[PDB]
Design a protein around this ligand. Structure first.
Ligand SMILES: NCCc1c[nH]c2ccc(O)cc12
Length: 387
């Protein structure tokens, strides 16, 4: 009963460590191998997000029809396959294929783990608060990602970070012996309202846009910042990956402090501050001309993204309880689609803008748009009811 929480937390951890061990390796590796590369790196990064966004409805169908453990085992297999593909392949196409597979793997793991965790814990009084461990699986994975993918990549080469990640994925899959079997036909029943009907509501879009933009900021920063750092003569030792470390250590505290303080000031008055602080603190990024000049803006970016996560995650459900037939899956689907839309559109537009007009202007434009988006949170003061 307890071990499912740890298993889903670890399966999110080993997915979102994989998601961010790529950012220091593949950009620099493709920069080196060719000695305008953004036109390819951006799409190589956006493939995972577009694949997960496409795949989510079908895995939802699979979970509704024939149960949760099957997609969990599928995701467990796909994560190891993608990791072993990263550890060995060199050509661009066979990195793109693995990043494509990682999208289906992330979809399976996230959706099925959320569903089965909700099923085991059932009622709100426990499950609703326990759900916040998803963010704790997010934060530590993102924290160990860049340092582990950079330091050992400097010390013992390309294959080491993915090799040691696979050494953990195999252990996690062996611990999953208790549930998953070669042959399992499993039951499930119908609940809730589908996303395609929920997003038809224009009011929920106002809340989804905040988290979408707050993640799109970092999703555009991710493909380009290593290239920008390489252009300004940065190294790998304590330099190439550690630049992302303050953002992670700040995210750890952002998901906790204002998560505790939410109700004390109004969650919309915290979402507004998170949005504005993201917009302001990504403007300071282009103007830093030294590695130690990037510590200050990242310590704000991570904190502000955590402040938006821990102040929008309950809200997407608080409204859905007031307007539509609600279930845990319908609550999580909004957040997952809002995450994936940003993580897909960000790199796709970045790989064009940063190459046609430049990276600092891309960050400035995103910051200004994020700042100007803030007044839209005025509407969440109180939503009116409906039939
Ligand atoms: N896809 C960007 C991953 C990433 C790198 N550094 C980060 C810092 C905080 C965060 O939430 C996420 C990240």
């Amino acid at each position: 009963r307890k071990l499912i929480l740890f298993i889903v937390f670890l399966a999110l951890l080993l997915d979102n460590m994989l998601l961010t061990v790529v950012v220091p390796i593949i950009p620099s590796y493709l920069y080196s191998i060719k000695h305008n590369e953004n036109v390819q790196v951006g799409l190589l990064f956006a493939s995972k997000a577009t694949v997960q966004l496409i795949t989510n409805p079908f895995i939802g169908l699979l979970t509704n029809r024939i149960g949760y453990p099957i997609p969990i085992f599928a995701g467990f297999c796909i994560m190891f396959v993608s990791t072993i593909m990263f550890a060995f392949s060199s050509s661009y196409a066979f990195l793109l294929i693995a990043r494509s597979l990682q999208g289906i793997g992330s979809s399976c793991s996230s959706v099925a783990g959320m569903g089965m965790l909700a099923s085991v814990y059932t009622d709100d009084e426990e499950r609703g608060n326990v759900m916040g461990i998803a963010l704790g699986g997010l934060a530590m994975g993102v924290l160990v990602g860049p340092p582990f993918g950079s330091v050992l990549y400097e010390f013992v080469g390309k294959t080491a970070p993915f090799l040691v990640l696979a050494a953990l994925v195999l252990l996690d899959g062996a611990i999953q012996l208790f549930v998953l079997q070669p042959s399992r036909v499993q039951p499930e029943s119908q609940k809730g309202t589908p996303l395609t009907t929920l997003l038809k509501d224009p009011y929920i879009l106002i809340a989804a846009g905040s988290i979408c933009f707050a993640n799109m900021g970092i999703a555009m920063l991710e493909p380009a910042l290593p290239i920008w750092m390489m252009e300004t003569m940065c190294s790998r030792k304590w330099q190439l990956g550690v630049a992302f470390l303050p953002a992670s250590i700040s995210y750890l505290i952002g998901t906790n402090i204002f998560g505790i303080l939410a109700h004390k000031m109004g969650r919309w008055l915290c979402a507004l501050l998170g949005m504005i602080i993201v917009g302001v603190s990504i403007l300071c990024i282009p103007f830093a001309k030294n590695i130690y000049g990037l510590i200050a803006p990242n310590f704000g970016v991570g904190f502000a993204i955590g402040m938006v996560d821990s102040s929008m995650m309950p809200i997407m459900g608080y409204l859905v309880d007031l307007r539509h037939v609600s279930v845990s899956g319908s609550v999580y689907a909004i957040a997952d689609v809002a995450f994936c839309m940003g993580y897909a559109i960000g790199p796709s537009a970045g790989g064009a803008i940063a190459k046609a007009i430049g990276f600092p202007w891309l960050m400035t434009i995103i910051g200004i748009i994020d700042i100007l988006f803030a007044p839209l949170c005025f509407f969440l003061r109180s939503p009116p009811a409906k039939e």
